[PDB]
Design a protein around this nucleic acid. Sequence first.
RNA 1: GUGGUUUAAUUCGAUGCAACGCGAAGAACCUUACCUGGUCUUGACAUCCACGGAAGUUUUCAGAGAUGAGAAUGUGCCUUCGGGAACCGUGAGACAGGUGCUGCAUGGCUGUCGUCAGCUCGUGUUGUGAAAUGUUGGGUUAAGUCCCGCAACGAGCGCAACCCUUAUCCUUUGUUGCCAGCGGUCCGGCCGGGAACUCAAAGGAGACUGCCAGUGAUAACUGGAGGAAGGUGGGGAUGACGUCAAGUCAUCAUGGCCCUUACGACCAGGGCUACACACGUGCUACAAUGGCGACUACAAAGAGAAGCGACCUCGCGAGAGCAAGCGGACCUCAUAAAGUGCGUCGUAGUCCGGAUUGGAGUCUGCAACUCGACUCCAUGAAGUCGGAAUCGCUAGUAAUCGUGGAUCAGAAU
Lengths: 61, 87, 126, 96, 206
Amino acid sequence: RWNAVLKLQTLPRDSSPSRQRNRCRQTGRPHGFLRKFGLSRIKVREAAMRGEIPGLKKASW
Amino acid sequence: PRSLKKGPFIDLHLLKKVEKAVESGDKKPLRTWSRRSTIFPNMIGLTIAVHNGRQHVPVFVTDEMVGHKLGEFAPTRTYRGHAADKK
Amino acid sequence: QYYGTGRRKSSAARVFIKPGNGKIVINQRSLEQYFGRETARMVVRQPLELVDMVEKLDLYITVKGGGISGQAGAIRHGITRALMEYDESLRSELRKAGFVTRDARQVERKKVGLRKARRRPQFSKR
Amino acid sequence: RIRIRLKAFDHRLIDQATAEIVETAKRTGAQVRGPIPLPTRKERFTVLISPHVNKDARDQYEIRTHLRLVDIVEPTEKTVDALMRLDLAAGVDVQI
Amino acid sequence: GQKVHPNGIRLGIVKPWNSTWFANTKEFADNLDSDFKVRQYLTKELAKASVSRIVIERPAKSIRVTIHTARPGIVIGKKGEDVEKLRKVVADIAGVPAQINIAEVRKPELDAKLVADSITSQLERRVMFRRAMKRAVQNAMRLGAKGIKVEVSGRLGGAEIARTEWYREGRVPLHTLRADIDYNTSEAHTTYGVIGVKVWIFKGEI
RNA sequence: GUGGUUUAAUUCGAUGCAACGCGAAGAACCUUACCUGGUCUUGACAUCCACGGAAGUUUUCAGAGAUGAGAAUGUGCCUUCGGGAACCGUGAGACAGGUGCUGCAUGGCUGUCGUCAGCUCGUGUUGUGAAAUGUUGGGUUAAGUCCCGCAACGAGCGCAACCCUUAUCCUUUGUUGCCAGCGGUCCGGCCGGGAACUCAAAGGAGACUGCCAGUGAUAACUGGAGGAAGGUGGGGAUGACGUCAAGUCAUCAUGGCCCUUACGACCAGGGCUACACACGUGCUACAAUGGCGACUACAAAGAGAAGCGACCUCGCGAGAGCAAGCGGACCUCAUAAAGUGCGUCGUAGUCCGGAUUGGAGUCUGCAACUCGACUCCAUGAAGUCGGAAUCGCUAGUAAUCGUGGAUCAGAAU
């Protein structure tokens, strides 16, 4: 929820600055993200196929 | 002509909390406004209250209910069923 | 004592010829015991018949892998090549039969577009 | 008594480096036990030649990883000085 | 009816590959796609020069690229100007620092890949093919060789119906997996239609 | 899968054999190309020009999403004499694209008679000629196989051979193998140790009808000895002059033709899994070398990062909860199935056979009602070799059982 995404709040609660987690930027999924892009595993793929992600290419075999 | 492929629409808000209550089991009945969302596993056993436009009705999600939208279990109109309303 | 390997399909049966009565030991078990009830078990002692031994030689076999058949043919070759060491002159006669030889026909997955990986799908009369 | 196993993908670049390590050690040090080939682990891939149809195609590819022994016994001060300095082979992974 | 690609059937024997480089499971694609992308420009920008082949080798993070041309004079440009342009423009394709070589080809008549271009070129214009082939086949035969054959289907002479000229000399054993026959294939755009040119060059048995 | 029927519409092509798990070597928004509704733009993609702020990052409001609106961190670099390269955004201009149609307009590739098999040429002769002869005739053979006579005489592709896998043997090498031989042994090659054996790899050796008997003009056929195997020992890849104007312009390339606010683009939702019937192609159907229950002994080639998943615990379970290790010729997928030893049974619907069905339940997956795998719990039929017909197979082969891999995020009878 817009409330759960409290990560956006620079100043954390009673917890130390370590409280700040991550949260995806496109979908906002805290589950599996990718620091480098800051996007979730389900967004990095959709963004990859579209080609909106520069330098990124689908590995072949 | 339904369609979901691999892009289900689950309002990012009613999906983040439903997962938060998964920390240790489930949580008491919750309330959501956007019924456009679709029912899924994580929401099994929980009691989500959909907004019919006037109030929130408790909808006990079930595995058999998975796949359908919350709005489908939240009737908009209200027909007294002018009768002995049996069965 | 004389040794004789013995190959066939996917089985290896070492043969140890030792002058004695005539009994053989297949994996700590008598000939009849191991190869119990099998008309083919006889071919295993064929090479000993040509040069006429058996009653003069005692054998100790050690086979592993494949099936009884492959083992039977394995022990055979092993005994044959083992007889060679005892007396090379036996080759001139033993070889005549064809015991100092293994064999291919190694099972092969039924190649596609065919049936036996060997036989091609014949055509219905032109 | 120093064993030097030389492994690589290319077969040629190995014979060059291997022979070098030997020749250079043939002077200062012993004559070396002689560089042998040893067994080479291989990895083959069977993929259809043509992209469409032709299932009976599947050409054979292979990525070999050759090895060497050499083994130089009775090492001397100069026996190693002729090793640490000269090193050309790039695709060769030495193991002294 | 057809015949297995000669260059592709003798790859295991006397017939090296266009690109030789170590294995790389996860990088095998990028490299290939790069090898094919580099050929794209080397097939056009290097047209007028008789491009026979384009060998490729990839070390760690580099590539040599040895384009064999009949007349490197045009490939090198004025006092070595074109080569500088190529090495640069090609760098745009792949940031990886690439090299470049210009090994000439002694007498193109022996190179099939070139004998095809000579034929199509004349055809693209407008001249009796039977003559072009009869000559080409004679040129490759004149310069030496042990065999040579040329073929052209499509609509020859602008004829309504498609035809396939033949003619050949010497020996051109396609079945003999050893002959080492240099093959070629040059397309040809025309006002009446497209036409492919096939020429075979048999040089030496071993 | 299709016809029919039906429906607002549930994309299109393929259709006797050469249609029907066929292209989709994998459709739950993407792929899709279908439909309703909302909505944008030089715009999903190509090249280039002029232009004030211009690179770039992170947030807010509204919303189904899209989209729109809105707010805030701020330049190295090529040079100061003036500037100025790059990407990017807006405004403006010049412009893009198409699996949309035609493979009887075609290239390329492929299927098919065929991998069947002959197909052709030079010259001489015969005919006005298109062509014929050459490969006719007598005896013979599996064969134009080869002579005798002979308008014919010779020659080039096809077959065969050349390559690779499976055997005979040998040479080279071995941390695969083995007390084969000796020693130690928690008796596991495990270790010492050594390369014989097995196996791995490369090269090489070997049948050629040569020898014997019969027949024959010969080739060659038939029988026989020798020989590991013989008359192409067993098999792959490979498919000609040409055929059907065979298949494909949605693999790609290509001639012609046909569309640019839209037969373009974004997004949400509703499917591809409608019937009273008719058809084609398939799967499930009914033990006792087959199989089942227990026990136990051998292989090769591959795969594994969020993935292969040891081990433990719950379940006659799938697979969970938990969790070690490897990143991998040192951990795992793996148990190889069968065999081997032992027992059951011999046709009684009897724990034999397991369908079907009810209940409970784990999981892969964002989902599995229609489409799942597996199995706990219970039920437990058809059968005792099954109407008209019909299919594959000949020696380690048939029938039968299990496993791996290519395609692949993921549903691979």
